[PDB]
A paper describes a structure:
Reversible phosphorylation of the alpha subunit of translation initiation factor 2 (eIF2a) is pivotal to control of global rates of protein synthesis and to modulating mRNA-specific translation in eukaryotes. In animal cells, eIF2a phosphorylation is reversed by cellular phosphatase complexes consisting of a protein phosphatase 1 catalytic subunit (PP1) and a substrate-specific regulatory subunit. An RVxF motif, common to many PP1 binding proteins, is present in the conserved functional core of the PPP1R15 family members and their viral counterparts, and plays an important role in assembly of the active holophosphatase complex. Our studies reveal the essential role of a third cellular factor, G-actin, in endowing the complex with substrate specificity and provide the first glimpse at the structure of a ternary holophosphatase complex possessing such substrate specificity.
PPP1R15A and PPP1R15B both formed stable complexes with PP1 (both the PP1A and PP1G isoforms were tested) but crystals suited for structural determination only arose from complexes between human PPP1R15B and mouse PP1G. The PPP1R15B peptide could be traced from K639, immediately N-terminal of the RVxF motif (K640VtF in human PPP1R15B), through to W662. As expected, the side chains of V641 and F643 (of the RVxF motif) engage hydrophobic crevices on the backside of the catalytic subunit, an interaction common to PP1 regulatory subunits. From there PPP1R15B winds its way through the C-terminal groove to the front of the catalytic subunit. Along this path PPP1R15B Y650 occupies a position similar to spinophilin F459 and PNUTS F411 whereas PPP1R15B I652 occupies a position similar to spinophilin T461 and PNUTS F413, whose side chains engage the ϕϕ motif binding-site of PP1. The side chain of PPP1R15B R658 engages a deep pocket on the PP1 surface, occupying the same position as spinophilin R469 and PNUTS R420 and forming a conserved salt bridge with PP1G D71 in the ‘Arg site’, as predicted by Choy and colleagues. Despite their presence in the crystallized proteins, none of the residues C-terminal to W662 could be assigned in the density maps, suggesting that the C-terminal portion of PPP1R15's functional core is disordered in the binary complex. Interestingly both spinophilin and PNUTS also appear to disengage from the surface of PP1 at a similar position (D475 of spinophilin and N424 of PNUTS), suggesting that the C-terminal extension of these regulatory subunits evolved to engage component(s) missing from the binary complex. PP1G in these crystals conformed to previous structural determinations of PP1 isoforms (RMS: 0.19–0.29 Å over more than 240 Cα atoms), indicating that the binding of PPP1R15 did not change PP1's structure. Residues C-terminal to W662, which are not conserved in other regulatory subunits, are also not resolved in crystal structures of the PPP1R15B-PP1G binary complex.
Numbering used by the authors:
A (entry chain B): 639 to 662
B (entry chain A): 6 to 22, 25 to 300
Amino acid sequence: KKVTFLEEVTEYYISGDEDRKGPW
Amino acid sequence: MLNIDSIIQRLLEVRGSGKNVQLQENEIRGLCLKSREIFLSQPILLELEAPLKICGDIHGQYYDLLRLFEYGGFPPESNYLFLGDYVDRGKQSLETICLLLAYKIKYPENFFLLRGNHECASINRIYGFYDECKRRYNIKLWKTFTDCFNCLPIAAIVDEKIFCCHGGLSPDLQSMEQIRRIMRPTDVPDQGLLCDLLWSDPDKDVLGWGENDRGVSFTFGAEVVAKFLHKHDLDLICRAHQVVEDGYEFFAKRQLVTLFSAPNYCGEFDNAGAMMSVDETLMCSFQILKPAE
Ligand SMILES: [Mn+2]
């Protein structure tokens, strides 16, 4: 069992027209 | 009365739409009380097998959590380990932690949640979770979440080669048995082993240990990481707790990775969120969620 890494990374565009801030 | 399947259906209904899901108070309380029993029936240091998917901070970005399952596969299609920080900062901490606890209850040997530094009353009283509970339900409900969070596991080891925790290493950590001996329920203390696991950071300009700029816990350098992996015969440290531009970021020649799964964090950053897939032979790969501009 030996940890390795894949070179390709998968990207997806998602919603940017969205509220993500909360009150505190 | 607790209908887990129904709860999950209601939570997942909102996909494709930041709309709320309003569960009954006794339903949310039930999620906490049942999940607390399961957390305590499992070890505080989890021993897990690949394949699984690993996610860092969510911070109440509920629709972004849904998007992670949409691309990773909904439980139990994939096993999941989350690295903590489910609540605070974002708009929908309640929906977020409710869905994660529901899945923990439904698939307790396929679905795992670690404690982050925000699953701590002294932090999430201030950074939004308490306000959200008070506004939408009441104070009693916040106190019930606290009682549940106090029983979350602290660390996991995947196939005896990947050590996972929210924050990082501790100068006090000499034996895994030390983690195992931590009794629950516990609050997160202001210093010491449990504090460091949830709060410490790597730092490429530190040799050995340093004072952390946050005002809590420590920073540690690359050679601390190396010596730790060699001593315990591990290959990798997987942790969260720092926003990173691409959602993942390597440290010390890929002996440590930071994962962060809240895209566009707070609205105050332009970061992607990432998830790490560990396949059966421990080949790790990354999926990236990126807000349109
Ligand atoms: Mn954190």
